[PDB]
Amino acid sequence: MADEATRRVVSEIPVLKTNAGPRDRELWVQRLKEEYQSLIRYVENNKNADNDWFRLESNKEGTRWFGKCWYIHDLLKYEFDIEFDIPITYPTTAPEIAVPELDGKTAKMYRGGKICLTDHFKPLWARNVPKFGLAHLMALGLGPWLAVEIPDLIQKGVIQHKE
């Protein structure tokens, strides 16, 4: 079940190849090309599915990422700023996405607004290293987190839509 669910979600996202993190020079440059190629294909697929739900940019070195995600609930669109640093031991270690506006607003999060994913995500990433990159982190991590947490917080009146 888990294998098929993963394949269904990521099958048209380009797979990554290079085992390199931020300190790895020419190999990191190559890994970043794979990350941008995989991200842009994922964005294009999302537009085609009427689900263009995020934008990301990075600093020059590709070690700090930041952007926006959108979530629709009862037809209202919510926007959240997101950010993350790339761990030195990336891509073996997954980055920790922060949604700073929601810091302290849900239990499924650490101090600083770092999202807390279920335990299934970590071994899933681990089993796939170095094939998964940032597109997969969005598709398999942030995406499903929002689909649980955002509805909950709206229902509890913690998140209100600005008019």
Side-chain angles (χ1 to χ4, degrees):
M1 193 144 306
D3 286 357
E4 182 69 12
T6 297
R7 199 198 59 87
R8 225 50 104 118
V9 177
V10 308
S11 71
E12 306 184 283
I13 299 171
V15 171
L16 290 90
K17 174 227 181 198
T18 303
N19 172 220
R23 299 185 329 186
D24 300 343
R25 297 286 318 277
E26 67 279 348
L27 293 173
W28 175 235
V29 169
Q30 171 59 35
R31 173 70 186 202
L32 280 170
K33 299 178 195 184
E34 298 165 15
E35 296 285 356
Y36 275 93
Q37 85 173 177
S38 175
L39 278 165
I40 205 61
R41 170 70 132 81
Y42 180 46
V43 171
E44 174 178 21
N45 294 350
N46 288 345
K47 289 183 168 180
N48 289 327
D50 190 47
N51 195 46
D52 189 12
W53 69 275
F54 78 93
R55 289 286 182 273
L56 280 169
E57 49 184 299
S58 78
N59 64 354
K60 179 177 179 177
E61 289 170 9
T63 60
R64 171 89 173 212
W65 294 72
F66 52 98
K68 288 179 176 84
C69 64
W70 295 273
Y71 185 81
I72 298 102
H73 186 70
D74 294 340
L75 295 179
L76 291 174
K77 195 190 298 187
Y78 298 77
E79 182 182 290
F80 309 93
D81 301 306
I82 60 180
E83 60 187 43
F84 54 92
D85 262 84
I86 298 302
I88 302 298
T89 47
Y90 188 78
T92 294
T93 301
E96 297 178 304
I97 294 172
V99 187
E101 281 159 288
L102 301 178
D103 180 21
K105 288 174 192 177
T106 168
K108 208 152 128 62
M109 172 180 272
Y110 301 105
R111 292 182 167 93
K114 278 178 187 67
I115 68 180
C116 184
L117 298 185
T118 64
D119 280 353
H120 176 66
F121 180 86
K122 273 180 173 174
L124 175 57
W125 179 276
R127 196 177 328 102
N128 284 97
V129 172
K131 291 185 285 186
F132 287 180
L134 299 185
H136 302 88
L137 177 69
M138 304 290 289
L140 298 173
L142 183 56
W145 186 88
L146 293 166
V148 172
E149 299 303 315
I150 306 309
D152 188 49
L153 290 184
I154 288 169
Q155 189 276 330
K156 292 169 163 159
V158 178
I159 294 178
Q160 303 179 355
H161 196 259
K162 278 201 285 305
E163 171 52 67

